Every structure is written in C-alpha cells, then in structure tokens.
Design an enzyme around this catalytic site. Structure first.
Site, PDB file in Angstrom:
ATOM      1  N   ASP A 132      -4.746  -5.093  -4.472  1.00 31.40           N
ATOM      2  CA  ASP A 132      -4.615  -6.009  -5.610  1.00 31.40           C
ATOM      3  C   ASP A 132      -3.224  -6.598  -5.907  1.00 31.40           C
ATOM      4  O   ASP A 132      -2.983  -7.075  -7.020  1.00 31.40           O
ATOM      5  CB  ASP A 132      -5.208  -5.353  -6.871  1.00 31.40           C
ATOM      6  CG  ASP A 132      -4.584  -3.998  -7.192  1.00 31.40           C
ATOM      7  OD1 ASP A 132      -3.760  -3.487  -6.400  1.00 31.40           O
ATOM      8  OD2 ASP A 132      -4.929  -3.441  -8.252  1.00 31.40           O
TER       9      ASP A 132
ATOM     10  N   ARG B 105     -10.100  -5.006   5.612  1.00 33.19           N
ATOM     11  CA  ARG B 105      -8.670  -4.736   5.798  1.00 33.19           C
ATOM     12  C   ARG B 105      -7.919  -4.654   4.462  1.00 33.19           C
ATOM     13  O   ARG B 105      -6.853  -4.041   4.380  1.00 33.19           O
ATOM     14  CB  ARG B 105      -8.031  -5.797   6.706  1.00 33.19           C
ATOM     15  CG  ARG B 105      -8.052  -7.202   6.121  1.00 33.19           C
ATOM     16  CD  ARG B 105      -7.566  -8.268   7.087  1.00 33.19           C
ATOM     17  NE  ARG B 105      -7.725  -9.590   6.484  1.00 33.19           N
ATOM     18  CZ  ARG B 105      -8.798 -10.364   6.630  1.00 33.19           C
ATOM     19  NH1 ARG B 105      -9.823  -9.975   7.384  1.00 33.19           N
ATOM     20  NH2 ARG B 105      -8.845 -11.538   6.022  1.00 33.19           N
ATOM     21  N   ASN B 106      -8.490  -5.271   3.427  1.00 30.31           N
ATOM     22  CA  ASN B 106      -7.898  -5.287   2.089  1.00 30.31           C
ATOM     23  C   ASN B 106      -8.645  -4.389   1.102  1.00 30.31           C
ATOM     24  O   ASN B 106      -8.536  -4.547  -0.117  1.00 30.31           O
ATOM     25  CB  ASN B 106      -7.785  -6.726   1.568  1.00 30.31           C
ATOM     26  CG  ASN B 106      -6.782  -7.554   2.355  1.00 30.31           C
ATOM     27  OD1 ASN B 106      -5.735  -7.056   2.775  1.00 30.31           O
ATOM     28  ND2 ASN B 106      -7.098  -8.825   2.557  1.00 30.31           N
TER      29      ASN B 106
ATOM     30  N   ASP C 285      -8.806 -12.991  -0.966  1.00 28.48           N
ATOM     31  CA  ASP C 285      -8.686 -12.387   0.367  1.00 28.48           C
ATOM     32  C   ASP C 285      -9.495 -11.093   0.518  1.00 28.48           C
ATOM     33  O   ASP C 285      -9.027 -10.111   1.103  1.00 28.48           O
ATOM     34  CB  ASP C 285      -7.209 -12.168   0.735  1.00 28.48           C
ATOM     35  CG  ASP C 285      -6.983 -12.069   2.241  1.00 28.48           C
ATOM     36  OD1 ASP C 285      -7.954 -12.227   3.017  1.00 28.48           O
ATOM     37  OD2 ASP C 285      -5.829 -11.826   2.653  1.00 28.48           O
TER      38      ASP C 285
HETATM   39  C1  SX7 Z   1      -1.738  -2.633  -3.800  1.00 25.94           C
HETATM   40  C2  SX7 Z   1      -2.662  -2.653  -2.595  1.00 25.94           C
HETATM   41  N1  SX7 Z   1      -1.991  -2.797  -1.308  1.00 25.94           N
HETATM   42  N2  SX7 Z   1      -1.836  -4.041  -0.799  1.00 25.94           N
HETATM   43  C3  SX7 Z   1      -1.207  -3.845   0.360  1.00 25.94           C
HETATM   44  C4  SX7 Z   1      -0.963  -2.487   0.609  1.00 25.94           C
HETATM   45  C5  SX7 Z   1      -1.474  -1.825  -0.489  1.00 25.94           C
HETATM   46  C6  SX7 Z   1      -1.476  -0.355  -0.690  1.00 25.94           C
HETATM   47  C7  SX7 Z   1      -1.316   0.293  -1.898  1.00 25.94           C
HETATM   48  N3  SX7 Z   1      -1.408   1.638  -1.665  1.00 25.94           N
HETATM   49  C8  SX7 Z   1      -1.618   1.865  -0.336  1.00 25.94           C
HETATM   50  N4  SX7 Z   1      -1.746   3.088   0.215  1.00 25.94           N
HETATM   51  C9  SX7 Z   1      -1.953   3.039   1.556  1.00 25.94           C
HETATM   52  C10 SX7 Z   1      -2.039   1.886   2.356  1.00 25.94           C
HETATM   53  C11 SX7 Z   1      -2.257   1.977   3.809  1.00 25.94           C
HETATM   54  C12 SX7 Z   1      -3.106   1.091   4.508  1.00 25.94           C
HETATM   55  C13 SX7 Z   1      -3.284   1.207   5.900  1.00 25.94           C
HETATM   56  C14 SX7 Z   1      -2.622   2.206   6.632  1.00 25.94           C
HETATM   57  N5  SX7 Z   1      -2.832   2.287   8.026  1.00 25.94           N
HETATM   58  C15 SX7 Z   1      -1.770   3.089   5.937  1.00 25.94           C
HETATM   59  C16 SX7 Z   1      -1.037   4.166   6.652  1.00 25.94           C
HETATM   60  O1  SX7 Z   1      -0.064   3.812   7.321  1.00 25.94           O
HETATM   61  N6  SX7 Z   1      -1.462   5.503   6.555  1.00 25.94           N
HETATM   62  C17 SX7 Z   1      -0.456   6.553   6.598  1.00 25.94           C
HETATM   63  C18 SX7 Z   1      -2.765   5.927   6.054  1.00 25.94           C
HETATM   64  C19 SX7 Z   1      -1.590   2.970   4.547  1.00 25.94           C
HETATM   65  C20 SX7 Z   1      -1.888   0.647   1.705  1.00 25.94           C
HETATM   66  C21 SX7 Z   1      -1.670   0.634   0.310  1.00 25.94           C
END
Ligand code: SX7
Length: 266
Positions: free
Chosen positions: A145, A131-132, A127
């Site tokens: 991951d 976005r990822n 994927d």
């Molecule tokens: C392991 C990898 N992974 N797989 C799914 C999610 C994650 C992830 C890990 N650590 C993360 N730290 C941040 C985020 C994330 C992504 C998008 C966003 N709009 C926000 C957000 O709301 N703010 C406050 C910046 C936060 C997603 C992850």
C-alpha cells in the site's frame, strides 16, 4: 505527530524482494527487537505524500504503517515486515497440500476485504497483482500500500502521457485511454484471482503483452484454470466485463468469497 520517529531507531539491512519494490529495505527496530520494512529515498514530494496517505490506512489486510522520518533527508517510511514475502513467489513455491483450495478462498477473501475498505474510504490501488500482495504466518495476506491514491469512488484518473502499465493486469479503458478508477482495480483483482487459481502462473501464457488488448476487444478472456470452481471463474469473468460499470463492486466480491470460504470450511 505520533508517527514521527528518530531515524537512528532503525538499523538498516539489505534491500528486500531482490530490489523489485525499489528502495525498500529490511531493517531492525532496536527498541522492540523487531524486523521491519523501510522505504527510503537516496521524487521527494511523491514520497512524502505516500507517508501522509499511509497514516490513514488501518485494515487487517493492508500493510500497517509503524512510523515515518519526514523532517530531513534521508526520509523513511517504516512498515511491518511480511515474513513470507510476496504472494506470487509464495504460491509458486508452496506445499499445495497445505495451501489447498480452502486456503486459496481464504486469501481471496482477505484481499477483497482490503479492496472493499479502499472502495469505502475512497482510495485506488492501480497496481493490484500477486507480486503486490504480501504473506505472513498462517496464510495471512496483506495488500501492499505505498502507492495508494486519493480518489472518490466512482471518479476517474488519467495517467500521464507515455505512461507504461503492467499490461496483462490492466483494464481495457486504462490501456486505450489511460483511465483508472476503482473498476480498473476490479479488473486487476480478476487477473489476481486467476493468478491465485493457477498458483502463480503468468496471465495470458505465451501471449505477448502487445497483443493482449486486441484479444480483449475481440471478446477473448482467459479460460477457467484447472481445478477452479465454476462460481469463482464466473466472478473472474464479471471482473473482466468490458464496460467498467458492469463490473461488480468489491463489497459484492467480498460477500461472495466470504460465503464461499465459510461453506468450504463447513
Ligand atoms: C508497504 C508494502 N510494500 N510495498 C513494497 C514493499 C512492501 C513491504 C512492506 N513490508 C514488507 N515486508 C516484506 C516484503 C518482502 C517481499 C518480497 C520478498 N522476497 C521479501 C524478502 O526479501 N524476504 C526476506 C521474505 C520481502 C515487502 C514488504
């Protein structure tokens, strides 16, 4: 093991990313006064396998596991928090004078480094997309991951009957035969490069996903984005070779971007 943690070590806050990643929450690791991300479950065996796989992942450009709660429900997977969210939103909202051409090359280099590691360690992503990918301070990019799968590099995986894919990032062999390999990740990386070059435009703009495969089999590919170097577009197109074996390895891609990044700096 060293990974197992007390659930009460973490204070849970709100769901992150608007809920797009499912049950993934912002949290506080009280001992370290540290903001963390916590995936919880409120299927069990899939979740616990994710926890197991994450323990083996150690790369600067893959999101780092911090700990797990796997003894009794609710189950936690605790990772570092990426302060700037995902690469798609980051590219769309950025200051383009700060996030310049050299930065785009830097991000592509980081992502390909991570993908070369997975290629080396026999993992498949399945994927890969903007976005990822996740952004930290100073244009640090890490590949998300949670859902990495064990698969010997070269081997193939067949998705379940009636499985739905993000079509515009999905390799032709995956769309037609549900077949996935490291080479289908390479295809997705090509689409990711296009996302990077356009600062987060939707792939195949105006084209309904239901019509994408038909275009691909007639030899249609997305044209070179505005301002994109010819060398970078040629890598995209190589990632989009119909035959999976004709696509470059992530080792070759990373070497190409590392060279381009170094020369762009000099
Ligand atoms: C392991 C990898 N992974 N797989 C799914 C999610 C994650 C992830 C890990 N650590 C993360 N730290 C941040 C985020 C994330 C992504 C998008 C966003 N709009 C926000 C957000 O709301 N703010 C406050 C910046 C936060 C997603 C992850």
């Amino acid at each position: 093991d060293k990974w197992e943690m007390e659930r009460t070590d973490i204070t849970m806050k709100h769901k992150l990313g608007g809920g797009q990643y499912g049950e993934v929450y912002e949290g506080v690791w009280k001992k370290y006064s540290l903001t963390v991300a916590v995936k919880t479950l409120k299927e069990v065996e899939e979740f616990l396998k994710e926890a197991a796989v994450m323990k083996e992942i150690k790369h600067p450009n893959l999101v780092q596991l911090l700990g797990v709660c796997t003894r009794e429900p609710p189950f936690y997977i605790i990772t570092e928090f990426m302060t700037y969210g995902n690469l798609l939103d980051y590219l769309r909202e950025c200051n383009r004078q700060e996030v310049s051409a050299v930065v785009l090359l830097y991000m592509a280099t980081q992502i390909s480094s991570a993908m070369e590691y997975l290629e080396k360690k026999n993992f498949i992503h399945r994927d890969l997309a903007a976005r990822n990918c996740l952004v930290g301070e100073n244009h640090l990019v890490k590949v998300a991951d949670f859902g990495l799968s064990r698969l010997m590099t070269g081997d193939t995986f067949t998705a379940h009957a009636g499985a739905k894919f993000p079509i515009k990032w999905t390799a032709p062999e995956s769309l037609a035969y549900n077949k996935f390999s490291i080479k289908s990740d390479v295809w997705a990386f090509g689409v990711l490069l296009w996302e990077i070059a356009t600062y987060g435009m939707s792939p195949y703009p105006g084209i309904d996903p239901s019509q994408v495969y038909e275009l691909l089999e007639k030899d249609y590919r997305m044209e070179r984005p505005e301002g994109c170097p010819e060398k970078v577009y040629e890598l995209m197109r190589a990632c989009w070779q119909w035959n999976p074996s004709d696509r470059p390895s992530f080792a070759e891609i990373h070497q190409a971007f590392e060279t381009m990044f170094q020369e762009s700096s000099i």
